[PDB]
Write an enzyme that holds these catalytic residues in place. Sequence first.
Site, short mmCIF file in Angstrom:
data_model
loop_
_atom_site.label_atom_id
_atom_site.label_comp_id
_atom_site.label_asym_id
_atom_site.label_seq_id
_atom_site.Cartn_x
_atom_site.Cartn_y
_atom_site.Cartn_z
N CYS A 5 7.21 5.43 14.44
CA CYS A 5 5.90 4.80 14.42
C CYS A 5 5.53 4.25 15.79
O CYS A 5 4.34 4.16 16.12
CB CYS A 5 5.90 3.69 13.38
SG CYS A 5 7.21 2.47 13.56
N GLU A 18 3.03 -2.31 6.86
CA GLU A 18 3.33 -2.02 8.25
C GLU A 18 3.10 -0.54 8.43
O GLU A 18 3.75 0.28 7.78
CB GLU A 18 4.76 -2.46 8.55
CG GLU A 18 4.95 -3.96 8.33
CD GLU A 18 3.99 -4.81 9.18
OE1 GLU A 18 4.28 -5.00 10.38
OE2 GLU A 18 2.95 -5.28 8.66
N1 NAD Z 1 4.66 -0.16 11.44
C1 NAD Z 1 6.00 0.26 11.25
O1 NAD Z 1 6.93 -0.50 11.45
C2 NAD Z 1 6.27 1.65 10.81
C3 NAD Z 1 7.61 2.10 10.76
C4 NAD Z 1 7.95 3.42 10.40
C5 NAD Z 1 6.93 4.27 10.03
N2 NAD Z 1 5.59 3.82 10.03
C6 NAD Z 1 4.58 4.75 9.64
O2 NAD Z 1 5.03 5.43 8.51
C7 NAD Z 1 4.49 6.72 8.56
C8 NAD Z 1 5.56 7.78 8.32
O3 NAD Z 1 6.35 7.55 7.17
P1 NAD Z 1 6.05 8.38 5.83
O4 NAD Z 1 5.63 9.76 6.23
O5 NAD Z 1 7.25 8.31 4.92
O6 NAD Z 1 4.76 7.66 5.22
P2 NAD Z 1 3.96 7.77 3.94
O7 NAD Z 1 2.68 6.91 4.00
O8 NAD Z 1 3.79 9.22 3.81
O9 NAD Z 1 4.93 7.43 2.85
C9 NAD Z 1 5.50 6.15 2.83
C10 NAD Z 1 5.99 5.74 1.44
O10 NAD Z 1 4.88 5.50 0.59
C11 NAD Z 1 5.13 6.27 -0.57
N3 NAD Z 1 3.85 6.63 -1.12
C12 NAD Z 1 3.08 7.74 -0.86
N4 NAD Z 1 1.94 7.65 -1.55
C13 NAD Z 1 1.93 6.47 -2.28
C14 NAD Z 1 1.04 5.87 -3.14
N5 NAD Z 1 -0.21 6.50 -3.45
N6 NAD Z 1 1.35 4.69 -3.67
C15 NAD Z 1 2.52 4.04 -3.41
N7 NAD Z 1 3.42 4.61 -2.57
C16 NAD Z 1 3.15 5.80 -2.01
C17 NAD Z 1 5.99 7.40 -0.17
O11 NAD Z 1 6.66 7.95 -1.26
C18 NAD Z 1 6.91 6.71 0.75
O12 NAD Z 1 7.94 6.08 0.08
C19 NAD Z 1 3.81 6.88 9.88
O13 NAD Z 1 2.46 6.73 9.77
C20 NAD Z 1 4.42 5.80 10.68
O14 NAD Z 1 3.67 5.39 11.78
C21 NAD Z 1 5.25 2.50 10.43
#
Ligand code: NAD
Lengths: 1213, 107, 54
Positions: free
Chosen positions: A824, A790
Site C-alpha cells: 500500500c 486503512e
Molecule cells: N493503509 C494500509 O495500511 C494498507 C495496507 C495494506 C493494503 N492496503 C490496501 O489494500 C489493498 C490491497 O489488498 P486487497 O487486494 O486484499 O484489498 P481488498 O479491498 O480487495 O480486499 C480486502 C479485504 O476485504 C474483503 N472484502 C472484499 N469485499 C468486501 C465486502 N464487500 N465487504 C467486506 N469485506 C470485503 C476481502 O475479502 C479482503 O479480506 C490496496 O488497495 C492497498 O493499498 C492498505
Amino acid sequence: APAPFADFAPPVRPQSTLRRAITAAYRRPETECLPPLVEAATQSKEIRDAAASTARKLIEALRGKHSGVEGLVQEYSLSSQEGVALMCLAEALLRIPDTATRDALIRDKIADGNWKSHLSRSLFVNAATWGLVVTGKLTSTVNDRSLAAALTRLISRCGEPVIRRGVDMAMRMMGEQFVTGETIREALKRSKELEEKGFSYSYDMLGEAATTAADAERYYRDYESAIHAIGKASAGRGIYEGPGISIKLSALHPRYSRAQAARVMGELLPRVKALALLAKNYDIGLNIDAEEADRLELSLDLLEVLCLDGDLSGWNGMGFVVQAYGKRCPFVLDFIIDLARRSGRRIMVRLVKGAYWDAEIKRAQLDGLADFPVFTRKIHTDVSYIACAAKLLAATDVVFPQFATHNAQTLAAIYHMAGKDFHVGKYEFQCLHGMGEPLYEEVVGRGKLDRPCRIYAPVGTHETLLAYLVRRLLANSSFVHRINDPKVSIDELIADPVEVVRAMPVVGAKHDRIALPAELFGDARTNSAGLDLSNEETLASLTEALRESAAMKWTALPQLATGPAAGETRTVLNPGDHRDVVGSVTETSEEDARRAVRLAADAAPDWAAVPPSERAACLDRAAELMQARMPTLLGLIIREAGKSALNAIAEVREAIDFLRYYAEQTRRTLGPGHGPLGPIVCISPWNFPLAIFTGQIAAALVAGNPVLAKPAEETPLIAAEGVRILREAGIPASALQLLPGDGRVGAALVAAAETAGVMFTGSTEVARLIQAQLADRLSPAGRPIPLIAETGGQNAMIVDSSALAEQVVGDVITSAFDSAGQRCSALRVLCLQEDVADRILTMLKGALHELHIGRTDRLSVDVGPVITSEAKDNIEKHIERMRGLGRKVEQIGLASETGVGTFVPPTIIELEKLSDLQREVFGPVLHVIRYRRDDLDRLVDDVNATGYGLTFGLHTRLDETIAHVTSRIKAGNLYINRNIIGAVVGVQPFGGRGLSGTGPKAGGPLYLGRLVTTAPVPPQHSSVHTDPVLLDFAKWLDGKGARAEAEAARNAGSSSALGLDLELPGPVGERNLYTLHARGRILLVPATESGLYHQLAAALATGNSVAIDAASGLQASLKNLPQTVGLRVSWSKDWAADGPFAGALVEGDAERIRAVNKAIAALPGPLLLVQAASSGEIARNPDAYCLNWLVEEVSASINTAAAGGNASLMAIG
Amino acid sequence: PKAGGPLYLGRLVTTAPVPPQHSSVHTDPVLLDFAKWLDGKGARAEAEAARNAGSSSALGLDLELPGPVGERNLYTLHARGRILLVPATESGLYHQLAAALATGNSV
Amino acid sequence: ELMQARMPTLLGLIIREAGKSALNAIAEVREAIDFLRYYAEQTRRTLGPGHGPL
Ligand SMILES: NC(=O)c1ccc[n+]([C@@H]2O[C@H](COP(=O)([O-])OP(=O)(O)OC[C@H]3O[C@@H](n4cnc5c(N)ncnc54)[C@H](O)[C@@H]3O)[C@@H](O)[C@H]2O)c1
Ligand SMILES: Cc1cc2nc3c(=O)[nH]c(=O)nc-3n(C[C@H](O)[C@H](O)[C@H](O)COP(=O)(O)OP(=O)(O)OC[C@H]3O[C@@H](n4cnc5c(N)ncnc54)[C@H](O)[C@@H]3O)c2cc1C
Ligand SMILES: COc1ccc(CO)cc1
Ligand SMILES: COc1ccc(CO)cc1
Ligand SMILES: [Mg+2]
C-alpha cells in the site's frame, strides 16, 4: 515443475573448513572475539617500550610540523557558515571550465553583488561535505538559507579578494589534496616526487556501486585505461617498487551481492580476470578493495577463482583488503594465507581497519540481526589490527602484508613487531594521499625507519571525488582528529590498545552506547529478529526449513468457537507457478459467519474478564512462537503470497512487532474502565497476509474484544497459521474465530447484528461498501459502530537537483517494485526536478533492467508475481491505456518461466501531469513526472489533490525544501532521503488520511483506544500547546454568557494533544518523528446551541476548521464571532459540495444519528470518522466527543546517514 | 529594531547588511500561494520577487543566544502584524504584498 | 577599555547625578561597555563598502 526451494540459495562452492570458520565468526559476540586477539597481539615489554618511544617520536614530529581553510577563515574573519558557503561558491565557480570566463564572472558579477542571479542547482548541494572540511562536524542536511545569508554577508563585507582566495583554495583541495590528480596521467606525473623518496602508489579511479550495466562498463574501461597508463609508467619496476591499481568489485557489476552470486561469478569475475591479465602483463599490483560486510565472503569466491586460474600464473600482483574492524578478519586471513599456499601466489594483503563502521551498525540494527559484524569499541579494532598484523608477519613467505594505517601507535607497534630484518618485498605500510604523507615522511627513507609506504591515490574529477568524500573524511576517535586536538596528550596517543583491552574488567565488552538490534526499544519490548541472507549457515538452514515448509499440508478452515466447520474447499495455488499447490482452504458459509458472530458475542464477557496483562501475555507468547517458527512461516508466505525471502522476513518481523507493541501498549494503558466494544470483525488484505492480519486481530483481542478474523481470499493459509499460533499462545477459540472466504464472508460479518466494531485494511472502494453497510447500524447504546478503515495510496516521491541519483534510484527501485509494487506504501509517482530528470530516468531504467522477476523460491529473485490473473489483467489494462495515450513505457522482459504464474514486469510510465492518474494501480507500475523548481509548491498541491495521503517521500539535501514540502504535504507517513515503504511498528506508526485512511494508525499509540468504549490516555499523549482559535472561541463564549460552554472549551483546549511532537526510539542513522496535527475540516451536525458550542470547542481545540450543517437552524447561535474563529467556520447546506471533510461530529437522538450517518456515508470521497452523541450525553460527559479522533497522526522518518556518515556515531568510540 | 540586537546597525546605513545568523528555513505559506497566483496571471517578475522574498525573509528565526548558565536567552522573529500598504502601481502593490506576506504580515 | 578601567570614577558620577545605587551604576557602565563591544563586533561581522552611512 521445479521442486519448491530446490535451488533457493546454493553456495558458489562447497564451504571448506577455512571458509566455514569465517562464516562462524560473522556475528560472534565481542567478548568472544577479543581474548584470542589480545593473545596474538601481545609483545614483550622491551618491544612495547620501544614501540611507545617510536610512536612518541613520530607524534612529536607530526605535531612539530603541523590549515589552508583555517588560514582563510582567520584572514577574512569568517564564521563557520561563511566558510562553508564560500567553499560552495568556489566549487560552483570551478564548474565554469574557462578560467577567463570564471574570473570575469567573479570580478564583474559575483563580487559586485547578487551572486544568486548568476549561479537549477543549489550552490549548497555539497555543503555537508564542505561543512566537514571547515568545521570537522557532519550535518546530514544543509541549511541553505543560512548559507545563502552567510554568502551574501561575506561577499558584501570582503568582496572579490575573499572569492579569489576561496576559488584558489577549493581548486587546490579538489585537484591536489582530495585527489592526486584529475586524470591518471596527471596523477602519475605528480607521483614522481614521492616515488623518488621511496614511496609507491596504488591508484583509485573512485568507481564504486555501479547502478546500471552502463555504469559498470564505464568503470571497467576506466580501470582498463588506468592499468595501461600505470603499467606504461611502471616500466618494469614490478609490483613492490612500482605503482599498482585498486578496484572495487561493486564498480564492476550493478548486482554485486550474495543474492546475485551466480551473476557475480558469471559476469563480474571475467571482468576482474581481464583487468588482472592486463595487470599481469605490465607486472603491476591489482588490489581488490574491501566494501560492506555482506560482500566479504562473496569476494572470497572471486579471489579463490582468480588465484587458481592458470592464465594469471607467474604474477604476484593480485591484492586483497581485509578489514580488522570485522570479526571475521583473522579467519579471513587464515583463508587467504592458505589460498596463497595452495595457489603459490604471494597475495598482497592490505590490512585496514575499515571504512563503513557507521553503516554496518545501522544495517545490523535495521535487519534485527543477532550482533554486529564489526567491533563496537574502537580499541577492539586496534587490537584486532595488531593481532592480524602478527598473523601476517608470520606468513611473509606466502603473502605480502601491506599495513594501511595513519595511526602512529599502530605503525610503531608493527614496525617493532616486524623486527630488524627487512627487504623491499617483505611487507610495506600504506597511507592515503593528502592525509598520510606527514606521518610516512617520518617512516620512509634510510634517514627515518627505512620502511616503504604505498600511497593510495584517488584519481578523478570534482564530481567523482565529492560523491563519497564524506565517508573518506570520517571522527572523535580517529587518530588524525586526535593528533590535531591539543587536549589529547602524546601519552594518550601512544597508549597501547592491547594492554588497555587486556586490563578491562570484561575483555571485549560491547560499547555501552550502541544497542544490539534486539535491544533497540530497551525495556519497552524486544525487537523482532531477522535473518542474515548473506550468511551461508543461515542460507543452508533456511533452505532446509523452506523445503520442509513446502512439504507441509497447509490448510485453512472456518474455525468457529465450536470447532472447524464444513464448507466449500479449494486449493490455494502459488501465484508464481499455478502448478505449485500450496494448500487447501475451506471457505465459510454466510450462515456460519453469522453463527460465528453470535458465538463471539456469547463469549465476549469471558474474554473481557481475562485481565489486560494476561491478554498481553498471550500476544507476547504468540510473538515468541512466530519468531521461533519464522523459517517455516517464510516458506508459506513466499509460496502463497508471491513474496521474496527478504520481504517474507519483514512480514513476519512486522507481525511479531505488532504483537509485542500492542502487548506493551496494553500494559501501559488498559484498566477496568476501558471496556471492550464487543465482537470485532477484522478484515485484512492479501498483500501483507500475516502482518496486517495479525496486527488488527492482536489489537482487538488485547483490548478485550473477541475477534472474527476474515483473511483475504487469496492468502488464507498464512492467516490460518497465525490463528493457530495465537490459539497456541493462549487465545481461546471463542475469542478468535477464523472465517476464510471472499468479500461475501466479510460483508456477512460486518452486517451481523452483534458486530461491535470493524477493522478493515484493504481498498478504498471496499471500505466505502463497508461504510455504507455500517451506516444502517447503531450499537445497543444507539451510537455508530466504530470502523478503522486503512485504505489505498497514490504515493509520490519528490526529488530535487540536490539529491544523489544513485541513492534516489535505489530507493525508487525498492519503493516502486519490491513485492511487485503490491505494498500500500509503494511509490506510484516519482516527481523529478527537470534539470536532473533525464539523468535519473536513465539510471532508473538501467537499474530496472537488472531486476530478476520470477517464482520467489529463489534468493536471486527480486520481483515476484502479482497475486492473481485478475490483478494482472487490471494492471495491464492500465499500462495499455497509458501506452495508448502515447506515454513512454519502459518494461523488463519476462522470462518464459513466468508463464506458469501471473507476472507483470516492472514498468516505468512517463506522465505529463499527475492528473493523468485516476485510482491506485496496485502493481509494479511507476509513473514519472517532471517539474520545474519554481513549481514545487504547485506540485505538492497536485500530490495532495488526488485525495490520497498515505506515504510520501522527499529526496533533498536542502533544509528549506524539507521545511516547505513537509509543511505542505498532507500524508500520514513521510520519508526523507530513504525509501517510502517503512512501517516499523512503533517507529513509523503507519496509516494515512483522506482516501488512504480513517486512522488511528496501526502500530501507533492511539490504536488500542479505538477498540474500547472509553479510550485510555496513550503513553506520552499530551501537548502543552493550546489552539489560539479555541482560546478566542472560549472568550467569545464567555462574552455571550455561555459560561459552562466556555469552561468546556478551555478544558478541550488543555485536553487536546494537538501539537504533540515526539521522537520515537529506533535505529541509529535515522530520526523517526511522530506528531499530532489537525485533521482538516470537520463536519458539525449539531441539534442544540449547547451541542454546537461543544462540537465547535472540540474541533477548534484540535486545530480544525468546521463546516456546520445549515439545516440545523443554529446560525443565530454564532453571531459576532471573532475573525480568527470566523475564518475556521463555514456553514454548509450541501455537505457533498463543501467537502472533503476529515471527520464529523453529530448530535442527536439515535434515529437522528442513524440518518446523519447515512447522509455522511453518501458523501463522495474519504470515509469520515464520525463521532455522535445525544444532547444529554454532551451534558453529562465532557468526553462525549473524544479528542483522540479529531487530530491526525503524522509519522516522519528521516535518514540522517544520507550524507554518507552518521554524525552522532562520530562521537561513539 | 532592538538596541543590543543584530538588526540595529542595519537601520543606520542606506543598504542594510545581512546580520549574523539572520535567516530562516521557513517560507510563509500565504507568500507561496501569492507567488503561484502571480505566475498564474503571468506576472513573472513579480512572482520571482515573491519567491525571493519568501526565501530571504527571516520570519521564523528562533535562536538561543550565548549567555550565563542557568538561563536560556531566546531570540525569535515574528510577523510585525498588519502593514499599511500605500502603492502607486499594480507592480508596486505586488512587490509590497510580496514583502509583507513573506514576513508573515497581513496588510 | 577606557570605560572599563574608569568604571569606579564613572560610578561615582552616575550615583550622584542620576540617583543610582552602586550596583545599578555598575550595571549602567557595564551596559555601555557591552554596547560598544557588541556594535564593534556586529560591525566586523557585517559592514562593507556597499553599506553606506546615512
Ligand atoms: N493503509 C494500509 O495500511 C494498507 C495496507 C495494506 C493494503 N492496503 C490496501 O489494500 C489493498 C490491497 O489488498 P486487497 O487486494 O486484499 O484489498 P481488498 O479491498 O480487495 O480486499 C480486502 C479485504 O476485504 C474483503 N472484502 C472484499 N469485499 C468486501 C465486502 N464487500 N465487504 C467486506 N469485506 C470485503 C476481502 O475479502 C479482503 O479480506 C490496496 O488497495 C492497498 O493499498 C492498505
Ligand atoms: C591506504 C588505505 C587503503 C584503505 N582501503 C580500505 C578498503 O578497501 N576498505 C575499507 O573498508 N577500508 C579501507 N581503508 C581504511 C579506512 O578507509 C580508514 O582509513 C581506516 O579504517 C582508518 O584507520 P586508521 O589506523 O587510519 O585510524 P584510526 O583512527 O586508528 O582508526 C579509525 C578506525 O577505527 C575504526 N573504528 C572507529 N570507531 C570504532 C568503533 N566504535 N568500534 C570499532 N571500530 C571503530 C574504523 O575502522 C575507523 O576507520 C584503507 C585505509 C588506507 C590508509
Ligand atoms: C580512503 O581509504 C579507502 C580506500 C578504499 C576503500 C574501499 O572501500 C575505502 C577507503
Ligand atoms: C539599557 O541600559 C541599561 C542600563 C542599566 C540597566 C540596569 O539598571 C538596565 C538597562
Ligand atoms: Mg479484492
